Curated annotation (Swiss-Prot), chain B:
Shown part of the complete sequence: 9 to 262 of 635
Domain notes: The SH2 domains mediate the interaction of SYK with the phosphorylated ITAM domains of transmembrane proteins. Some proteins like CLEC1B have a partial ITAM domain (also called hemITAM) containing a single YxxL motif. The interaction with SYK requires CLEC1B homodimerization.
Assembly: Interacts with LYN; phosphorylates SYK. Interacts with RHOH (phosphorylated); regulates mast cells activation. Interacts with NFAM1 (phosphorylated); probably involved in BCR signaling. Interacts with VAV1 (via SH2 domain); phosphorylates VAV1 upon BCR activation. Interacts with GAB2 (phosphorylated); probably involved in IgE Fc receptor signaling. Interacts (via its SH2 domains) with CD79A (via its phosphorylated ITAM domain); the interaction stimulates SYK autophosphorylation and activation. Interacts with FCRL3.
Protein name as it appears in the record: Tyrosine-protein kinase SYK
Functional note: Non-receptor tyrosine kinase which mediates signal transduction downstream of a variety of transmembrane receptors including classical immunoreceptors like the B-cell receptor (BCR). Regulates several biological processes including innate and adaptive immunity, cell adhesion, osteoclast maturation, platelet activation and vascular development. Assembles into signaling complexes with activated receptors at the plasma membrane via interaction between its SH2 domains and the receptor tyrosine-phosphorylated ITAM domains.
Gene: SYK
Domain SH2: 7-99, 160-251
Compartment(s): Cell membrane; Cytoplasm, Cytosol
Region (Interdomain A): 100-159
Tissue: Widely expressed in hematopoietic cells (at protein level). Expressed in neutrophils (at protein level). Within the B-cell compartment, expressed from pro- and pre-B cells to plasma cells.
Modified residues (Phosphoserine): 36, 194
Coiled-coil positions: none
Annotated disorder: Immunodeficiency 82 with systemic inflammation: An autosomal dominant immunologic disorder with onset in early childhood. It is characterized by recurrent infections with various organisms, and multi-organ inflammation that manifests as colitis, hepatitis, arthritis and dermatitis. Patients have a propensity for the development of lymphoma, usually in adulthood. Disease severity is variable.
Positions bearing Phosphotyrosine: 20, 39, 123
Domain of life: Eukaryota
Curated annotation (Swiss-Prot), chains D, E, F:
Parent sequence residues shown: 186 to 203 of 207
Protein name in the entry: T-cell surface glycoprotein CD3 epsilon chain
Domain ITAM: 1-18
Function according to Swiss-Prot or TrEMBL: Part of the TCR-CD3 complex present on T-lymphocyte cell surface that plays an essential role in adaptive immune response. When antigen presenting cells (APCs) activate T-cell receptor (TCR), TCR-mediated signals are transmitted across the cell membrane by the CD3 chains CD3D, CD3E, CD3G and CD3Z. All CD3 chains contain immunoreceptor tyrosine-based activation motifs (ITAMs) in their cytoplasmic domain. Upon TCR engagement, these motifs become phosphorylated by Src family protein tyrosine kinases LCK and FYN, resulting in the activation of downstream signaling pathways.
Top-level taxon of the source organism: Eukaryota
Self-association and partners: The TCR-CD3 complex is composed of a CD3D/CD3E and a CD3G/CD3E heterodimers that preferentially associate with TCRalpha and TCRbeta, respectively, to form TCRalpha/CD3E/CD3G and TCRbeta/CD3G/CD3E trimers. In turn, the hexamer interacts with CD3Z homodimer to form the TCR-CD3 complex. Alternatively, TCRalpha and TCRbeta can be replaced by TCRgamma and TCRdelta. Interacts with CD6. Interacts (via Proline-rich sequence) with NCK1; the interaction is ligand dependent but independent of tyrosine kinase activation.
Modified residues annotated as Phosphotyrosine in this record: 3, 14
Organism this protein belongs to: Homo sapiens
Disease cited in the entry: Immunodeficiency 18: An autosomal recessive primary immunodeficiency characterized by onset in infancy or early childhood of recurrent infections. The severity is variable, encompassing both a mild immunodeficiency and severe combined immunodeficiency (SCID), resulting in early death without bone marrow transplantation in some patients. Immunologic work-up of the IMD18 SCID patients shows a T cell-negative, B cell-positive, natural killer (NK) cell-positive phenotype, whereas T-cell development is not impaired in the mild form of IMD18.
Location relative to the cell: Cell membrane
Post-translational modifications: Phosphorylated on Tyr residues after T-cell receptor triggering by LCK in association with CD4/CD8.
Amino acid sequence: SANHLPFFFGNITREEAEDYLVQGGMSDGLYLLRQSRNYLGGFALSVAHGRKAHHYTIERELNGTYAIAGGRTHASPADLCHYHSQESDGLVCLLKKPFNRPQGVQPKTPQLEKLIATTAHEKMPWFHGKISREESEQIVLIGSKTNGKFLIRARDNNGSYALCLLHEGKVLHYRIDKDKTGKLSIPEGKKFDTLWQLVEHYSYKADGLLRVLTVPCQKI
Amino acid sequence: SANHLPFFFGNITREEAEDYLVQGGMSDGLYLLRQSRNYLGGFALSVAHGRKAHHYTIERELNGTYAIAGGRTHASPADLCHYHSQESDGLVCLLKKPFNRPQGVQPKTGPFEDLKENLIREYVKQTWNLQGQALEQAIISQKPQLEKLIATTAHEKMPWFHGKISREESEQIVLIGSKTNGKFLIRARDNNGSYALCLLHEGKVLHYRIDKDKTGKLSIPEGKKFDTLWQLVEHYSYKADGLLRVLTVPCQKI
Amino acid sequence: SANHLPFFFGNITREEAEDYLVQGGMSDGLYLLRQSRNYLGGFALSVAHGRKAHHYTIERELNGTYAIAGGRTHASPADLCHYHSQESDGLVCLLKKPFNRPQGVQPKTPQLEKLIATTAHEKMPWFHGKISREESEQIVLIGSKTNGKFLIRARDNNGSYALCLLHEGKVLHYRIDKDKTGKLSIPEGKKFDTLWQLVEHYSYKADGLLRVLTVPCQKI
Amino acid sequence: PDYEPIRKGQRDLYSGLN
Amino acid sequence: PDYEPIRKGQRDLYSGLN
Amino acid sequence: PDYEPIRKGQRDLYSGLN
């Protein structure tokens, strides 16, 4: 509940952040902490360095400890910060100045949480249970041919799903899969813990998809 | 006026309907009745067969009877439905279940079914210079035929319709003012025979030819076919269906 | 401040004007006065004649007097019209009927003007002092990649600035120059006395740009 | 002198009997 | 190294005296 | 039979340790 953190800005887009940083000085070592939006209970570190910005994601260790994968595990992002404020250890640079939450601005917005989320899409419109690759095309070419209309259907398991969306009259299928870690993600694409997440995001930035997600194709 | 039929959705889009049916179940034999949009007073019957949708146009027979061309003519559409409910008769399938207007939803009204109803009430008070209670009568009495009149000639009053005009007198009048895209207008390139459609596309003016075929039905060559333009427009100003784009705003007349 | 004049509409565009005319009758001799947008403290006269529209630019003479280039100079815009209403004088026609400020409508929003203007950008979000063609790429690519984001930086030929904007993830540089007259304009494009005006224009109609200006790139 | 032609392939047509 | 060129088509012209 | 590849050129990557 990083809320007591004055340089913590709730759910903020990676963009919104980079903005705050230049609007902050863009001074080497300038950093800010926001909540992650593709890893449950995790966060991301945004640090300015070399006039560029660098985003690091802080995964939550099952132990309940936090750690940017590959490095030591710290007890709280608070600590993590301090420690990286004195020890580069992997980071492009030392964490000099934090970027506190501007005047007024507030933060944007045990195990159950793990579940609920993983399977949230289950009840969401764009999600069309088990369905054929064709069952889909048609189901999506029917009605409103608005661009970016989409849905995601499962393939045989509870591990492999697919993304179907409309683009200039044609329907495009994007493979989705659950790698070793139980982390879903289109091949070569961002990685998430869930889909309401996967979507939420691809509905906000193409980030590789030929276009962004729009309106949830209707289900029978 | 099919409004009592619970599976009747006023002026709905072919797509808008296609959705309703999936929202319906796309279960074979599912159908719903909607008012036609390019055939005066006729209707359209939409039905679910094999996860696919099939659209039928119930045209209105001069006899006051309705019939999808090719088949028997029925009293009312409800009958026609009742009928096809037990006899394929050329139809992809029987009509098992009707898709009823979901809780709350009401029938769609075109943007002039509203206009018209008054448009004439006007015509009347004017040409017939009567009023009070006299007016009330004339219309309910005369109504039936009047419609077919006001309709075929209402565009005469519509902003997008610019009387008889030169091919260029057009180019210009549309280029003038705001060059917002999809700006259009229709000019008759001949009194009542055929007209023409002009619209703006990437600063470019586009002229699409329109003509009245043997049947007195206007249709862009290779394009859908309408009774009136008021209809024609209302459609293309919804889906390109061929045009390089859709109509937006009615270029203004001088 | 020809505000008193009832046939005067502040900052209106050529187009917004040509509309008012037809929506006014487009009857020959119909006219209205609006502010010019590329010539400091001058004005523009538009008159209906031949169903087509005629735009005249009323420049402000250093004497503080105004006069469409090539003709007599009048005391105030109000006179010019009173005079051209009885006299064609090169004017394609007589100024019979003016077009008055529609019921309710308001006007859209001697030397000072000419000053603060050439130099107002100095204080404008979209204007980024002196900076490399790169320092820009950067600063511009940082933060939200919303298309059409822009800014102007001055090169080094101090009377020579440049235009930078975002188009499909790509940054575009458009050269700006102050011609012999001290008037800035992109090679081959419209000319204005200042930028706060050059911008205000192009952030309305491409008029040649690959797209229209939108949001002012944040400056550090 | 020149009217713009269509792209027929994209035509929502109406099913018929038989 | 490369500056972008313009697009004539969208150009408003002004009327002169005489 | 054919899925859409992602256009690598367009992904906001994430920085990594070392």
